[PDB]
Amino acid sequence: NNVTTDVGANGWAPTVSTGLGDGPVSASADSLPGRSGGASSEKTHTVSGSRFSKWWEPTGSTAPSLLAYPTATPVPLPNPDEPSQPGPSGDRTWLLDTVTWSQEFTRGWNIAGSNGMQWTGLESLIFPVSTDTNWTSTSSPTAYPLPFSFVRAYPDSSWAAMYNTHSMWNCGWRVQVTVNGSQFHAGALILYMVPEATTHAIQTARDNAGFVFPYVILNLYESNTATIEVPYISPTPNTSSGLHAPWTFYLQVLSPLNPPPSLPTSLSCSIYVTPVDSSFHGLRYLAPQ
């Protein structure tokens, strides 16, 4: 017990899969040779260690500031090419956007500025994502899709240079926001990192259960800044350039800004973005996002 079902258990050689009786078939781990990638922070990619004959041959936030998830283990890559790394010119803290936070904003109000995008999941994204109609909307923007917003903000960076030149990329992300209020100010913002942002996922991030996602709170009672970092995620070991946003940043309001009387009714915020441990595979011609 060992519930009454059968998870596996598995079998082999003719135990759980013979011509007399059967249990449910299970897939085994594929042991592959190749260059160690996928998991950011711990890249250290190096060489690894035909096999058939032919017929013609003879608690929580805003406590500390640590990664939302712990970094995972590297895996052997399918492609044999050596990656191109931007280094310190790419992996650095960039000023993503500067946005205003007024008291009129209520619970679960996503805040974004000029470099941000209106993305509640219902917007019809015209391909490619670099089309101006995606970023300019009748209402205020809400999200910061990575790396789409980062590449648009700095199209001339070494990170974006390789991003428009390689078919696939791999890096983590660190977002920080600084909001200075006097000791007389009150209010709280939440820095959300939403994986694979879609209609239902973004609306549940506004709600009470949203704290399942990576989060840190920027409470004006004690903090002036809050940092959050997330390692790389994707269904593939390397993400396709211009066609996939693994992480998206959301700066929403938990407790509406409560400024002291006779002071401004809004505070300025500065959003930063940091790609962590970047590698790019498959060099070819320039194809922007």
Residues that bind another protein (CB under 8 A): 30, 32, 50, 78-81, 95, 98, 128, 167-168, 178-185, 224, 236-238, 240, 242-243, 260-264, 267-268, 270, 281-287
183 contact choice in a copy of itself, another protein, none (CB below 5 to 8 Å, kind-dependent):
another protein
- Piece in contact with a copy of itself (CB under 8 A), picked from 31-39, 80-88, 135-143, 253-261: 80-88
User: Closer to a copy of itself at the Cβ: 162 or 245?
Assistant: 162
With binding defined as CB under 8 A, does residue 151 bind a copy of itself? Answer: no
Amino acid at 268: S
With binding defined as CB under 8 A, does residue 167 bind a copy of itself? Answer: no
57 contact choice in a copy of itself, another protein, none (CB below 5 to 8 Å, kind-dependent):
none
Separation between Cα atoms, residue 31 and residue 260, nearest integer Å: 62
128 contact choice in a copy of itself, another protein, none (CB below 5 to 8 Å, kind-dependent):
another protein
Cα angle for residues 40, 69, 194 (degrees, 5° grid): 95
Q: Which of residues 200-239 bind a copy of itself (CB under 8 A)?
A: none
Residue (of 272, 173, 177, 280) closest to 231 by Cα position: 173
With binding defined as CB under 8 A, does residue 161 bind a copy of itself? Answer: yes
Neighbours of 215 (CB within 10 A): 22
With binding defined as CB under 8 A, does residue 47 bind a copy of itself? Answer: no
Cβ atoms of 52 and 84 closer than 8 Å:
no
Token readout for 116 is: 């941000």
- Piece in contact with a copy of itself (CB under 8 A), picked from 120-128, 153-161, 221-229, 243-251: 153-161
Smallest distance from a copy of itself to CB 278, Å? 12
Smallest distance from a copy of itself to CB 243, Å? 20
Token readout for 94 is: 């960039």
User: Closer to a copy of itself at the Cβ: 154 or 213?
Assistant: 154
Q: What are phi and psi of 199, to 5 degrees?
A: -50, -50
Q: Which residues contact 17 (CB under 8 A, 6 or more apart)?
A: 11, 23, 25
Q: What is the DSSP letter of 28?
A: P
Token readout for 184 is: 């007389």
85 contact choice in a copy of itself, another protein, none (CB below 5 to 8 Å, kind-dependent):
a copy of itself
Cβ atoms of 92 and 150 closer than 8 Å:
no
Smallest distance from another protein to CB 142, Å? 21
Separation between Cα atoms, residue 121 and residue 110, nearest integer Å: 13
**Residue 168, burial from CB neighbour count under 10 angstroms (0-12, 13-18, 19+):** buried
Report the residue from 65, 71, 79, 85 that binds a copy of itself according to the rule CB under 8 A.
85
Q: Which residues bind a copy of itself (CB under 8 A)?
A: 82, 84-89, 156, 158, 161-162, 164-165, 283, 286
